[model samples]
Target: MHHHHHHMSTNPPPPETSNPNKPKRQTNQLQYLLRVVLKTLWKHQFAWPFQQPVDAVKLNLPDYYKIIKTPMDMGTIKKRLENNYYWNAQECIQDFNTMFTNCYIYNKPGDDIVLMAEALEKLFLQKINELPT
Candidate 1:
């Protein structure tokens, strides 16, 4: 009598990043989008008293620790909201468009930022319609 046995390999280990010395960058697409939407909301004074990155959490939105290599400022946003200055639709749209171009054109490899800008644009459009002329 003869017996045969077979073996199967398990899953491969995690893939290595390009640079071993540098740690991989972690990003959350939704967080960036929320930042853009929240920033626009704060600038337009749409959501007063709730204009910080953390406040997005209260709205059931997710907040991120930071961008790839930089920190986003929620405090400055809060201060700006406290100042109580608002931008009209035209001004807000212009500013957001400029930011969108800068993110996608001048900067390289920031698709996440591009998405953020796009989300803001849609949110802004709805907001503009709601605003009275």
Candidate 2:
């Protein structure tokens, strides 16, 4: 929820970024720490490609439509297959691809996915801990 980019900090030394006019020594230390963290994350990212927002599915347009077809009960025979057709293949593909990729990034290993999943599974415990209960 913090606006501060975890990527930008790389290797944050301490939460002492509150002061605008930090000392030169502190600035240098923070920079070095950030670089190290980023480098470590980068090195392992390839093995865990999920860390970098890799594509989850590699299907073509027809394949994509196959997985996303609508149910028949909602419309007439003609409309059942093509009703509520809002986007062209290109538009749907682009937006879906973008969102899926971003989800992969956020849910990648060593990111927040595991913790988030566990929290969600715990029902009321997670909800209370996650918010100002």
Candidate 3:
């Protein structure tokens, strides 16, 4: 009998999928980070990122599941993040952070979807200050 070696999927090939805007311009391979969510984040960011600590880490890290025991969203996030001005500045990242926060914790940590953590978290931070507020 031949034995097949199986490995944990924790470290995937670094998710660069969510959205690449390939259209017919699919020649770009390194289309990560920047061309990923920044197009969305930069276009719709507000004080949402400010007042909050950079990296924010947002606690729980991946353990936040137990800490928050909360659930989250994305498109609706786009609704607000897109033009919820006069809304809550810190609010955007509130849910944004929770999403990936929970996302990474769930996905990155254990059984969450590979689509969850990588897609959400990597889309935020660092250059996030590029907010249009």
Name the best candidate (by TM-score): 3
Clashing pairs in 1: none
* Clashes within 3 Å, all models in order: 0, 1, 0
Report clash pairs, candidate 3.
Answer: none
Give the per-residue lDDT digits (tens) of candidate 2, residues 1-133.
8766663312212112123343223233233223432233224423243222222243122332233322111112112112323223232223323433433433455556444433322431322232211
Model 3 local distance difference test score: 0.41
Ranking by TM-score, best first?
A: 3, 1, 2
| CA lDDT scores, all candidates in order | 0.38, 0.29, 0.41
Kindly list the per-residue Cα lDDT of model 1 for residues 1-133, writing each as its tens digit: 2343443222222112133454322223223323554456656533432223223234332322121122223233333222332233342234345444443553355465455555555675665554332
- Looking at candidate 2, the ten consecutive residues that score lowest on lDDT are 71-80
Q: What does the lDDT come to for candidate 1?
A: 0.38
**How high a TM-score does candidate 2 get?**
0.20
Clashing pairs in 2: 11-34
- The C-alpha stretches of model 1 lying farther than 4 A from their native spots are 1-81, 86-89, 108-110
Global Cα lDDT for candidate 2? 0.29
